């Protein structure tokens, strides 16, 4: 869903596009239709 979203791409602090973890933290609790449990669980699932 959030692929290409403007309020997810607001905090993509990477020119190469291999973005950090905390971009997903900031750009999906600032942005709604998500939840912080899902955020921390996803970055648990993410490759750190």
């Amino acid at each position: 869903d959030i692929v290409g979203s403007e309020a997810f791409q607001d905090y993509v602090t990477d020119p190469r596009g291999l973005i950090s973890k905390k971009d997903f933290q900031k750009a999906m609790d600032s942005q709604k239709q998500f939840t912080g449990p899902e955020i921390q669980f996803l970055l648990s699932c993410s490759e750190a």
Binding site: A7, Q31, K32, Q33
Partner: protein
């Protein structure tokens, strides 16, 4: 459909229409999941805070 773009900012927009709460209504509906300041610069509404 573009000529109306240049009147969104003004306060005198909802002149003859009755329910002039309109800006607050769109801010309540869509402003939560968007820039509330994006609303408060697009739709006028100077100093929404």
């Amino acid at each position: 459909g573009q000529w109306d773009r240049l009147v969104l900012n003004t306060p005198s927009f909802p002149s003859n229409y009755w329910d002039k709460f309109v800006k607050r209504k769109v801010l309540d509906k869509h402003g939560d999941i968007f820039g509330r300041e994006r609303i408060a610069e697009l739709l006028g509404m100077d100093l929404a805070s």
